[PDB]
Structure formats: structure tokens, C-alpha cells
Ligand binder design. Structure first.
Ligand code: FAD
Length: 357
């Protein structure tokens, strides 16, 4: 049968939801393409989510393009394992060209093509779409004295179960949905403190993450009609009152302080005299984009982000970034929201590559 094409039209780097949704749209084109994903099997970063994690909206509101997420038969929003299974079944449905396990090291512009390199294995492509997520680049803010702290430090990226924290005094740093959920779970076994940059904001009890998607969509539509609305703010990471978080609220757990000033050997200290000893800190302080494979090109800013117009990289030809965060399209880092930019990305790749008869 035919060899792999010496030049692929498109390489997609990654194999999670964003890559798959991009693959869905590429399948209605005539372009040759290939997905390269570093893990042994399907599931993207959901493989690394903590054991109890569930989505903040129902299945219907957590679907990527095409085949929708099966409704769970047990009560509650889809679990981590539900998402993994969804993605696994979605790949089985469409038989996308995916190679695993392939860790892309770099991307090199050579002659007017992209050379994509994973160790020994290299491919050439006319276009490269990066959809590598964020989980592999946990971010911790640069607080003084962290190196001195003698208790446990872990990022949420590495959290799985609350067991080893039981009976301890634990600080959760970071708001949003992740902070609130991790805090809620830790508080069931440990004495907790929550640190957030701003006072946390909660959605009403009767609503779900579809509200956050609406807000996102309203923002991009305004960014694109008569563009305005600084007031009110987006509240784009207001907290959804998922069951464990609603239970935490009843126990008085959802109260936060503003950031401390430094770490000591035994805990933290604020500029105003607050001083708190801690056995462990769980950093729910977010992530940077997983763009190490673009560093040699020089496009990754001090931010860790890259200058883009929607998903198109500004400084370089025929490169797109899909699904990383609002900075690559409002709501693009969610199951429901990635579709809009995966779709428009595929159209832009077509526009760049299709040739007259
Ligand atoms: C704790 C948590 C809770 C969340 N809750 C929700 C929710 O309730 N609802 C919702 O819609 N979204 C939620 N999200 C957000 C978003 O949907 C997830 O972050 C999701 O994993 C993003 O999918 P992605 O495809 O962009 O990235 P990923 O799932 O990270 O997929 C990227 C894939 O590319 C691979 N890869 C990375 N670098 C390379 C490389 N160099 N070469 C080859 N492969 C590479 C990765 O290993 C991975 O398999 C949550 C995220 C987190 C962290």
C-alpha cells in the first residue's frame, strides 16, 4: 500500500480532546494528516485527573463536535473515567490517523515546510496545529522562601487522593473550580486554609458550567460585533456548586484569605502579622501552555504564551494553537468550547493549503 506521504499537509501535535476535535474537522477535507500523542493510549490530561473528579456540567454540555458524550447511567456529572472512555470511543468511531506514544521534541522551519521531530522519528508538514494542553506545565507563583518550607508541597497536577493528607493542616492556594474542589475534598480529612488572589465568586446553586460557556460566548460575539463590555467583568472562572463544593459550604469550609507574603520553615507569614503553621500546601495555581516543542522557534514569550490572532500564530507561517485557554479563543480549554476554534482552525488551514485544479 502507499507509503506515508513524504510531506503531510497537516501534523496535529497532541491526542486529547482538542486534537481529536481538530481531527474531526480535518476529516471532511482532502488534506493528509497525522496526530502525534505522547501517551500510551487515549484520554489526554484526564488520565492525570484526581480520582473523584467530575465535570462541572452534564454530558450534553461536555461534548466535542460530532458524536456526543454518552449520558452517565449513575447520578451526577460525568466522571474522569467517563471522559476518558468518551475520548477512547470517539477515536474508535472515527479511526483517525494517530501515532502513540510519540513525544514531539521540536518543530523546525526548513525550506517552507515544518519539520516535526520526536527523537529519531521526523516528519515534514505544510501546516502544524499544536493541541498539547496545559497539564504538563504546572505553574506555582514565585513566593519568597518556598525552598525553606519543610512540609509537603504538591501541585493539583499531581494530586490524586486525600489520604496522605489526613489529620494534617493543609493550605490550598488558588481559587477557581479546581481550588474549590480540592479544598472541599481535603477538608473532609484535614484542617484547611484557602488562599485566593481575590475573594472567590460562586455561581448559584441551581446552575452549572453552561453559564460559564454562555459568558465566554457572549465575550467572543462582542469581540466581533460592536466590541465593548468591561462592566461587568466576565467572571469566567466563577465556581460551580458541584456536590462536594455545596457540601463543603455547609461545613464552613469555603472561606479564603488573600495571599501571604512568604514561606517560613514551618508555614507561611503575611505582611500584617498573620502567621500560620502548615504540614502541606496544595498548589491549585494553574498551568502554562505545553509549548516546549516551539521554544526553538523563539515564539514562546516570558508568559509561556505565544502571540496569536484567534488560533493563528502571528510570527510564523502555517502554525496554529488550539485549545490552550481563553487566550486561544474564549472557552477553547473546555470540552464544549474547543469545537468553535477547532472548526475555524481547520478552515484556515484549508484556506492556506488548498490548491486550484
Ligand atoms: C482539574 C481540571 C478540571 C477540569 N474540569 C473541566 C470540566 O468540568 N469541563 C470542561 O469542559 N473542561 C474541564 N477542564 C478543562 C479542559 O477540558 C482540560 O484541561 C482538558 O484536558 C483540555 O484538553 P486538551 O485536549 O486541550 O489538552 P490535553 O487533555 O492535555 O491533551 C493534550 C495531549 O497532548 C499530549 N502532549 C503534550 N505535549 C506533547 C508533545 N510534545 N508531543 C506529543 N504529545 C503531547 C498530552 O500528553 C495529551 O495526551 C478541566 C481541567 C482540569 C485541569
Amino acid at each position: 500500500g502507499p507509503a506515508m506521504p513524504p510531506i503531510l499537509d497537516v501534523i496535529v501535535i497532541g491526542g486529547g480532546q482538542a486534537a481529536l476535535t481538530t481531527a474531526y474537522f480535518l476529516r471532511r477535507t482532502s488534506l493528509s494528516y497525522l496526530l502525534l500523542d505522547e501517551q500510551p493510549g487515549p484520554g489526554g490530561a484526564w488520565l492525570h485527573a484526581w480520582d473523584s473528579l467530575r465535570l462541572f456540567s452534564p454530558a450534553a454540555w461536555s461534548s466535542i463536535a460530532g458524536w456526543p458524550m454518552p449520558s452517565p447511567t449513575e447520578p451526577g456529572n460525568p466522571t474522569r473515567n467517563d471522559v476518558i472512555d468518551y475520548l477512547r470511543r470517539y477515536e474508535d468511531r472515527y479511526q483517525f490517523p494517530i501515532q502513540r506514544p510519540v513525544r514531539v521534541d521540536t518543530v523546525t522551519r526548513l525550506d517552507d515546510l515544518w519539520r516535526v521531530q520526536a527523537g529519531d522519528q521526523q516528519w515534514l508538514a505544510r501546516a502544524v496545529i499544536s493541541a498539547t494542553g496545559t497539564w504538563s506545565k504546572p505553574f506555582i507563583p514565585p513566593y519568597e522562601g518556598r525552598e525553606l518550607f519543610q512540609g509537603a508541597q504538591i501541585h493539583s497536577a499531581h494530586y490524586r487522593t486525600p489520604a496522605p493528607f489526613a489529620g494534617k493542616r493543609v493550605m490550598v492556594v488558588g481559587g477557581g473550580n479546581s481550588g474549590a474542589q480540592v479544598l472541599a475534598e481535603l477538608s473532609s480529612v484535614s484542617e484547611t486554609l484557602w488562599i485566593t488572589q481575590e475573594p472567590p465568586a460562586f455561581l448559584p446553586d441551581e446552575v452549572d458550567g453552561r453559564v460559564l460557556f454562555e459568558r465566554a460566548t457572549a465575550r467572543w460575539k462582542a469581540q466581533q460585533e460592536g466590541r465593548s463590555i468591561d462592566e461587568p467583568a466576565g467572571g469566567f472562572g466563577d465556581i460551580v456548586m458541584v456536590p462536594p463544593v455545596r457540601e463543603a459550604r455547609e461545613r464552613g469550609v469555603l472561606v479564603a484569605e488573600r495571599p501571604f507574603a512568604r514561606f517560613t520553615e514551618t508555614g507561611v507569614e503575611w505582611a500584617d502579622g498573620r502567621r500560620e503553621n502548615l504540614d502541606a500546601v496544595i498548589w491549585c495555581s494553574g498551568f502554562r501552555p505545553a509549548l516546549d516543542h516551539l521554544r526553538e522557534l523563539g515564539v514562546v514569550e516570558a508568559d509561556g504564551k505565544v502571540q496569536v490572532e484567534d488560533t493563528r500564530v502571528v510570527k510564523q507561517p502555517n502554525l496554529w494553537l488550539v485549545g490552550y485557554g481563553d487566550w486561544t479563543g474564549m472557552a477553547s480549554a473546555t470540552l464544549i468550547g474547543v469545537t468553535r476554534t477547532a472548526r475555524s482552525t481547520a478552515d484556515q488551514v484549508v484556506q492556506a493549503l488548498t490548491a486550484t485544479p
